[PDB]
Design a protein around this ligand. Sequence first.
Ligand SMILES: NC(=[NH2+])NCCC[C@H](N)C(=O)O
Length: 232
Amino acid sequence: RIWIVGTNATYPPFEYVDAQGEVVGFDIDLAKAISEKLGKQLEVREFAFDALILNLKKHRIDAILAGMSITPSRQKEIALLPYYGDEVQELMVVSKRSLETPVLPLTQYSSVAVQTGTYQEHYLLSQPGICVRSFDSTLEVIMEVRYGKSPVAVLEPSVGRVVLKDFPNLVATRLELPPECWVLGCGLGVAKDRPEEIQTIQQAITDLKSEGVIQSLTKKWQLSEVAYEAAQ
Ligand SMILES: NC(=[NH2+])NCCC[C@H](N)C(=O)O
């Protein structure tokens, strides 16, 4: 009957809280489409990002849609079905335009702002000489920079490309990741002991891709490289 998708709505444009108090975004739109393919009614529930895997494992939720990067370590705990993105080999470092080059390396700073429980936080914490401050939300991370409280932050590029549009005084610099910290694109999480749901859900994703629904949705939430609309 009900299909519970766990998420952490802290994370534009995948899932976040709008001006009205409503949870919206690319993942939410996808969860809606998928639940329709599944014959089930969608319910979205909020958890801390780091709590999602355990809830899923325990079947306190039925799936995860949380912009969750595919990594081997996560794959040991659950299934992650590819639905967006490609390999990530770099990160953005955000700073005020006023901050003098070189922005790199990150060891030069009093702190570096980053979102909690994320692979990019774990990268920073494994590097020598980085003082990390971690926050609930992407906005908090960026506000920490524009408010002068951290000289720099780190975002994922797919996220940074979208969010930084609204901050004309911030600038972003590529920071290549060591190949041992490259991750894959985003996967929809399903418990590993549920193969039947895996297949069903995999088939819903392939169907939405075929139908052009996933392309529409990636455009709608600015997750695709922008194309021109050409009259033919
Ligand atoms: N809804 C969220 N808070 N998502 C955070 C995902 C960040 C990054 N893609 C990771 O998987 O570690």
